Design an enzyme around this catalytic site. Structure first.
Site, short mmCIF file in Angstrom:
data_model
loop_
_atom_site.label_atom_id
_atom_site.label_comp_id
_atom_site.label_asym_id
_atom_site.label_seq_id
_atom_site.Cartn_x
_atom_site.Cartn_y
_atom_site.Cartn_z
N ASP A 1 -2.44 0.77 12.04
CA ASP A 1 -2.47 0.06 10.76
C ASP A 1 -3.77 0.43 10.06
OD1 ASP A 1 -0.18 -1.13 11.81
OD2 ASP A 1 -0.75 -3.16 11.20
N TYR B 1 15.07 -4.01 10.45
CA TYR B 1 15.66 -2.84 11.09
C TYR B 1 17.14 -3.00 11.42
CZ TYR B 1 10.71 -2.15 12.27
OH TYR B 1 9.34 -2.02 12.22
N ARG C 1 16.96 -6.35 13.84
CA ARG C 1 15.71 -7.02 14.15
C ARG C 1 14.84 -7.04 12.90
NH1 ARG C 1 10.51 -4.90 15.66
NH2 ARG C 1 9.19 -6.54 16.60
N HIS D 1 0.74 2.37 17.69
CA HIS D 1 1.91 1.63 18.14
C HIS D 1 3.14 2.11 17.37
CE1 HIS D 1 0.14 -0.92 14.90
NE2 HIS D 1 1.40 -1.11 14.55
N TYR E 1 0.81 -1.22 0.00
CA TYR E 1 0.00 0.00 0.00
C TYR E 1 0.84 1.27 0.00
CZ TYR E 1 0.87 -0.26 5.04
OH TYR E 1 1.46 -0.35 6.27
N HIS F 1 1.65 4.96 14.66
CA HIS F 1 0.66 4.83 13.60
C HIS F 1 -0.39 3.83 14.04
CE1 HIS F 1 3.33 1.37 12.81
NE2 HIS F 1 2.25 0.80 12.30
N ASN G 1 9.56 -6.24 7.84
CA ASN G 1 10.32 -5.05 8.21
C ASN G 1 11.67 -5.50 8.73
OD1 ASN G 1 7.89 -3.71 7.74
ND2 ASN G 1 7.94 -2.54 9.65
MN MN Z 1 1.93 -1.38 12.38
#
Ligand code: MN
Length: 210
Positions: free
Chosen positions: A123, A112, A194, A183, A67, A121, A110
């Site tokens: 979701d 990191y 991570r 979160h 998205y 944010h 993700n």
């Molecule tokens: Mn999220």
């Protein structure tokens, strides 16, 4: 108060959080190897353009659906969920009753580097059904709820809830924790590399780019 009003909201967030392990560390190492293969494949430019989103200290890899007011990309713009994500991750969660069979149609990785983060944010509620499931890899960290990312000077405000997420942790967000508070991952909470696999179902009526 403060202590009470804060504990009160922390309890609301907790009501929307379920955690599990399930994966052994050995099983984690195997998944981590596949994550590394995704990283290597992306670095070689072998994926569709929209599959890979690179940022300072953080890359995102979008499979199934991606998205970008958020809108899904048109179909065929991002890569399919790899067979290993189905076989090693999604299927395990289905067999253990964490999510229904056929639920997940989006998987985002993700990855990191130390000091990487993701700003507060929710979701997108017009894009994704709940619950939102994530599985964490490589190292231990924490998911924070309700933080404000401030400026002049740069700082992150106190969390409403600080939730430890250890390597191999499955975190399931629903209700208040998924809908009514943000979160984030704070930079201070990523001391080593991570990665996390986020598994979600898109809404049947999610808006999509043409
Ligand atoms: Mn999220």
């Amino acid at each position: 108060e403060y202590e009470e009003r804060r504990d009160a909201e922390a309890r609301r967030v907790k009501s929307g959080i379920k955690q599990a392990s399930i994966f052994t560390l050995e099983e984690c190492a195997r998944i981590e190897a596949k994550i590394d293969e995704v990283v290597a494949k992306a670095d070689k430019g072998l994926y569709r353009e929209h599959t890979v989103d690179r940022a300072p200290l953080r890359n995102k890899y979008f499979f199934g659906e991606g998205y970008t007011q958020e809108r899904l990309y048109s179909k065929g713009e991002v890569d399919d969920i790899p067979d290993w994500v189905h076989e090693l991750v999604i299927d395990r969660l289905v067999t253990h009753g964490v999510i229904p069979e056929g639920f997940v149609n989006s998987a985002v990785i993700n990855d990191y580097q130390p000091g990487g983060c993701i700003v507060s944010h929710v979701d997108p509620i017009h894009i994704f059904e709940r619950p939102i499931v994530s599985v964490s890899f490589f190292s231990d960290s924490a998911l924070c709820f309700g933080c404000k990312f401030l400026f002049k000077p740069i700082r992150v405000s106190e969390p409403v809830l600080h939730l430890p997420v250890r390597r191999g942790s499955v975190t399931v967000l629903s209700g208040y924790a998924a809908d009514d508070i943000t979160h984030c991952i704070r930079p201070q909470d990523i001391k080593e590399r991570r990665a996390v696999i986020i598994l979600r179902k898109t809404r049947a009526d999610a808006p999509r780019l043409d």
